[PDB]
Design a protein around this ligand. Structure first.
Ligand SMILES: Nc1nc2[nH]c(SCc3ccccc3F)nc2c(=O)[nH]1
Ligand SMILES: Nc1nc2[nH]c(SCc3ccccc3F)nc2c(=O)[nH]1
Lengths: 273, 264
């Protein structure tokens, strides 16, 4: 019965959804063709991102981010029924994205930028809170935790409170442990192994492992050879009741999720732990 | 901690193993070549079958099955360290397979043919017991009862419980619903304290769910493998070894980080 509400429609999270990655970091036409392919392959959310969130990434000006993101969000919202998430940290991109039809604010920085928290609250949209240690320029230099699960859990307690106190209701929130965002290989797998334990907040869990270093470093291969590992990650997360799976390879992930759904439907508990 | 012993070597079941499918139904050279490819992709067991096990595959005589199966088992045992599973129901093939180096007797009929039970016992080899019957009142309970019965039948014939493996038999007299019920509850079969072997690769339980043909089932096959392996399944029987081994390494990294070392 978990549901999100945005832009006059709803997203029913009684089964896992696949979120397709639309990286915008002729551009507009190609972006829209890619969205269309992902929607046809079964993605029910498209994640539009105009600033690199990779280790070492450089900042993008607000004017450049607006130019990359807003025309894409608008074009998708006008042509398809799919939900649209916006991968942004900037109050102006948040505001302007919501005006042209975006459904979810998916900020790697959990609205930490000046004015972001107020901008998000003003839109009334769902907000995903993600854990990152440090920032993208520093996060992978030397990630360190005494207990990564406890520290991510504590972060979620603190950020939920921060959001509620700004007037964003608990029911609008999603949580994401932020695979690859200030974590070494062992930290990532600790979080994946214990993912179901984050259900105590009674909030949707969003995860993104597709073609990430936690697969590449395990298998010692480049990004192009990570699909089997990516599907394994997706299935592991979805078997533990993760609600949204953020991926590059939509068709394959959707097929894997249908198998997970068939399995969970046969189960009494409806989850693994 | 679980281990099997055969032909002077051992199989460490503390982590999942991928078993590659070698159907043998210059054919010898091609079979060795395919075994080589699967071993280089990380398979640690090869399942050699001489009479196909598909729903209505043609039955073959003992002489034909020996001619097809024994040279392949022999060639692999001479050339590789990999374990060799033989898919047969005939006592003669069980016997002769053991003599040329097979490690596991994998009989879809659970040694129900005349003399098969005795032949298997004489070899001293590990034996896989598979459920095959679609109608059930409670499919898990029916499969669980069958294991209890076959375990006892084996022990009574002098086959130590420690030589046995259990397989719920995905796709063997089971509809879509029954197959997913057994997959959902697979971890409950650990109460026997025996190895669990599963084979879902490219099966109807994927094909019918997704509405795709047999060459378009890789993603669903990998999902099934992962679901089984996260529940502590010990051996995963597959067509697509490279991809399954990669998925199993992710499963292993996850289980190594977990307190339980499995999901239920
Ligand atoms: N919510 C959410 N948004 C995201 N955006 C990115 S991309 C940068 C990236 C970072 C680290 C490793 C590989 C990468 F590709 N990853 C996520 C995620 O896991 N969750
Ligand atoms: N132990 C064990 N041995 C096996 N041999 C086969 S091939 C049959 C087969 C192939 C294709 C479609 C349907 C089928 F029934 N499947 C298994 C298994 O699931 N477990």
């Amino acid at each position: 019965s978990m549901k999100l509400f945005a832009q006059g429609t709803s997203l029913d999270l009684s089964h896992p959804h696949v979120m397709g990655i639309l990286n915008v970091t002729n551009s507009l036409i190609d972006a829209v063709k890619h969205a269309n392919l992902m929607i046809n392959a079964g993605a029910t959310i498209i994640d539009v991102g105009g600033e690199s969130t990779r280790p070492g990434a450089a900042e993008v000006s607000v004017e450049e981010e607006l130019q990359r993101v807003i025309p894409v969000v608008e074009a998708i919202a006008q042509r398809f029924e799919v939900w649209i998430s916006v991968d942004t940290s900037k109050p102006e991109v948040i505001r302007e994205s919501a005006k042209v039809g975006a459904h979810i604010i998916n900020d790697i920085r959990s609205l930490s930028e000046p004015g972001a928290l107020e901008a998000a609250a003003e839109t009334g949209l769902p907000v995903c809170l993600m854990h990152m240690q440090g920032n993208p320029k520093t996060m992978q230099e030397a990630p360190k935790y005494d207990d990564v699960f406890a520290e991510v859990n504590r972060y979620f307690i603190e950020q939920i409170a921060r959001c509620e106190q700004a007037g964003i209701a608990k029911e609008k929130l999603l949580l994401d442990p932020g695979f690859g965002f200030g974590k070494n290989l062992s930290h990532n797998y600790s979080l994946l192994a214990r993912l179901a334990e984050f259900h105590h907040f009674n909030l949707p869990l969003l995860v993104g492992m597709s073609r990430k270093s936690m697969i590449g470093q395990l298998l010692n291969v480049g990004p192009s050879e990570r699909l089997s590992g990516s599907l394994a990650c997706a299935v592991i997360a979805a078997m533990q009741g993760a609600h949204i799976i953020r991926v590059h390879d939509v068709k394959e992930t959707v097929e894997a999720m249908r198998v997970v759904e068939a399995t969970l439907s046969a189960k009494e508990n409806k989850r693994y732990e």
